[PDB]
Amino acid sequence: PSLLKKLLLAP
C-alpha cells in the first residue's frame, strides 16, 4: 500500500 496508510495503521 501507500506509505501514509502504513503510518496511520501502525501500532
Next chain:
Amino acid sequence: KSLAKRIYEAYLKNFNMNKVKARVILSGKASNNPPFVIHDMETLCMAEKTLVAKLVANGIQNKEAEVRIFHCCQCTSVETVTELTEFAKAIPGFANLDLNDQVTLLKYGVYEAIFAMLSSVMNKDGMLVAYGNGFITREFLKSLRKPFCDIMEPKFDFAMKFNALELDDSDISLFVAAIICCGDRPGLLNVGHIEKMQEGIVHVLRLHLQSNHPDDIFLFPKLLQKMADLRQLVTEHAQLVQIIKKTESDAALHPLLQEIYRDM
C-alpha cells in the same frame, strides 16, 4: 469538551522539539551540549564528523554540501511527518475518520504544520538542526548554489513575523490541530464531519487565545490569516520540490515525501 488539554498533551508527547526546548538552546543557555554553529563549508564538515560519523566514514563529503544539507532536511521532514501522524491520531475524533480521509488530511496538512512548527527553531540568524545540537546560519544557507539557497529564505521570513506574535506551545498545539483537521482539502469524502471537527478546534483556539494573550485583541484573526499564508508558502515550496525532481541528479526524494507531493 476538554479538547484543548488533550491536544496540548498530544503535542507535548509527540514532538521531540518544541518552542520551550528550542528557546533554551537559542537564548544561549545550553551549556552542556551547546549547538555547534554551522556557518561555512568547514564547520559543516566538523559537525558531520561529530554527529553522523558513520556517514562521513562512507564518503558523504564526496557529495556537495547542498546535497548533504538537502538529505539532512529531508530526514527531518520524514521524522516530523511521523510525529505529526501520531499527533493527529491523538486529536479527539481523528481516529474515527475514514482511512482515506485520514490520508487526505495528512497529505495536504503536514507541510503547513512543519513550516509553522519550523518557526519555533528559528531566529533571525539561523535554525536549529540535529535535535538541537546544531545551528546552521541563515547566511550560510543563502550562500549555497541555486536552487538550494532559495528553499529556506521564505521560511525564515514567515517565521520572523509568526514569532513576533509570541505564541507558546499551548497555542501552537491548537494551531497545528486546526491545520490538520481542515474540511476544504481536495478529495475529502466526509467533509461535513471534518468541518465540524475544525469548528470545535477553532472555537477552543479562539477561547484559549483570549485568556492566554488577553492584550492582543486581534490575535485570533491574525492567526487565521497565518493559516492562509502557510498554504501559499507550501504551494510555493512545492514548485521548488519540482525543480529538484527534474534538474538535480543526486537529490533523490524519499518515497514518503513524493507520495505527499504527488498531487499538490
